[PDB]
Amino acid sequence: KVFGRCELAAAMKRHGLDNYRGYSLGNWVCAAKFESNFNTQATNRNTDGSTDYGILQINSRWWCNDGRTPGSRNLCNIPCSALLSSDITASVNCAKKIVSDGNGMNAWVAWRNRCKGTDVQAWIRGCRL
């Protein structure tokens, strides 16, 4: 599923992402935009052989099992395919655990390089929340 901007904001809000560990909703939407272009089925292969999955491009190195990242962990205890679902529940719950792990949203390289410090509020402007 390819979400609309305001549609994703609402689903992120419903799932408790707005101000989760102090990150306003617009941070999350900006992250999703640049990670996946709001496409729940986005995947991208990393050079180390791990893979990023779904709306927030959650990495198999630590967070999900895809059965093909030697030595990796599955800290969200999910198959990485759960992160490609039209329902973002699994992605959001796993994101909550990632953003809690000490570096906040800097765990997402695209958030740091493209959202961090920007007017992230623009990403929820006009949305009925």
Q: How far apart are CA 91 and CA 96, in angstroms?
A: 9
Residue 52 designated active-site: yes
Let me know if 87 is a catalytic residue. Answer: no
* Structure determined by: X-ray
18, 52, 66, 87: the active-site residue: 52
For 1-129, CATH number out of 3.20.20.70, 1.20.1250.20, 1.10.530.10, 3.40.30.10 equals: 1.10.530.10
User: CA nearest 28: which of 49, 70, 57, 48?
Assistant: 57
Selected catalytic residue, list 35, 48, 66, 87: 35
Is there a binding annotation on residue 101? yes
Q: Which residues are bridge partners to 15 per DSSP?
A: none
